[PDB]
Amino acid sequence: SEEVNERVKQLAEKAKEATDKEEVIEIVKELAELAKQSTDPNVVAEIVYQLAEVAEHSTDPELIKEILQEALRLAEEQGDEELAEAARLALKAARLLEEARQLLSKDPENEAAKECLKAVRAALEAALLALLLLAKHPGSQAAQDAVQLATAALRAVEAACQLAKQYPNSDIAKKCIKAASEAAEEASKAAEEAQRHPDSQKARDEIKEASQKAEEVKERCERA
Numbered sequence: 001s002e003e004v005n006e007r008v009k010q011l012a013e014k015a016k017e018a019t020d021k022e023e024v025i026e027i028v029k030e031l032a033e034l035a036k037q038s039t040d041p042n043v044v045a046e047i048v049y050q051l052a053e054v055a056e057h058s059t060d061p062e063l064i065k066e067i068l069q070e071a072l073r074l075a076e077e078q079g080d081e082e083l084a085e086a087a088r089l090a091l092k093a094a095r096l097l098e099e100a101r102q103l104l105s106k107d108p109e110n111e112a113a114k115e116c117l118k119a120v121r122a123a124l125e126a127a128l129l130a131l132l133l134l135a136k137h138p139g140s141q142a143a144q145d146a147v148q149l150a151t152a153a154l155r156a157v158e159a160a161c162q163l164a165k166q167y168p169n170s171d172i173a174k175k176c177i178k179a180a181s182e183a184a185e186e187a188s189k190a191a192e193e194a195q196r197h198p199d200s201q202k203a204r205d206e207i208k209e210a211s212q213k214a215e216e217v218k219e220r221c222e223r224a
Contacts (some may be wrong), residue, residue, distance in 0.1 A: 004123055005046070006037055011025045012050040013087045021063050028054060032070045035077070036181045049135035061101060064124070065094040069130070080206065086131040086147050086178070091159050093154055096161070101214040103165055112164035115177040122184035126150040129191035133198060142194040152214035153187035156180050159221035176221040182219040186210045 008031065015027040031051060032034050048071045051073040055067040075084035100120040104113040130146035137143050160180030163173040190206040197203040 004034060004040075004043055008034060008043065008046055008050060012054065012150045015050075015054045016057060022062055023052065024063060025066055028067050029071055029112040031129070035074050041078065041080075044074055045080075045135055045138075048074050048083060048187065049132060052087075052090070052131045052135060053129055055094075056125070056132070061094060063165065065091065065098060068094055069075060076167075083131075083134060086134045089122065089150055089154065089209065090127040090131050091145065093120065093127045093150075096120050096154065096173050097124055098160065100161060103161070107168075108160075110164070110168055112174060112177055115174075115181050116161040116164040119160055119177065119181040119184045122181065122188045123150070123154045123157045126153050126184065126188040126191045129188065129195045133191070133195045137198045140194075140196055140198050142204050142207060145204070145211075146191045146194050149190060149207050149211050149214065152211050152218065153184050156183050156214050156217040156221060159218055163221065163224060172224050176224055179217045179220060183210070183213050187214055 009029045011027055015024050015031070018027055019023040028051060031047050035047055051067055051071040051074075055064045055071075058064050058067065069124070070085060072084060072087035072091050074180070077089045097120045100113075100117045104110065104117050107113055127150035130143065130150045133140065133143040133146050157180050160177040164177055167173050187190075187210040190210040192198070193206050194203040
């Protein structure tokens with residue numbers, strides 16, 4: 001028992017101290033394997049939580065995505081529909097990040113692609129924070145709302161990024177993408193206050209304000 005909980009904390013630190021992408025992923029796969037040694041729902045929740053943190057402190061999109069596929073795989077094996085939803089969203093934000101980087105690569109001077117990219121980063125961070133909050137406090141109305149926020153934020157970014165690729169160098173399209181970036185950033189800020197302050201009401205107050213914004217930018221961008 002304690003030999004497991006202690007080991008989760010150790011491997012997590014090892015991953016954060018790793019010096020190459022290949023070592024991070026090897027440690028990550030060792031964290032996931034510890035799930036095999038237990039059926040305790042809390043040990044898997046803690047492992048998923050550590051995976052989200054390893055991902056949140058990484059910058060390589062490919063690595064992040066691989067970390068999150070593991071986290072989703074664990075949630076799915078648990079039958080935990082709620083935690084799997086959160087991991088799958090973050091995973092999808094990471095895949096959008098990979099796509100956003102490809103878009104910019106084809107037209108690196110394109111300010112629309114740059115803004116789309118910045119928007120996805122903020123969306124990814126918002127979804128990762130929600131996952132961190134849920135992984136520790138499933139019953140929270142803030143965690144669940146945070147997941148809902150990150151969902152809305154990502155929908156808006158996808159619409160904004162859709163135009164950055166479709167019709168760029170156009171004032172009309174350039175405004176949504178600017179709004180989407182701002183929307184994603186605020187969503188990331190809201191989800192952060194909630195992550196460090198789950199039970200706080202000011203935390204719950206911030207999450208709600210960002211969804212309306214997220215919802216408005218989605219409706220704004222679909223227009224363009």
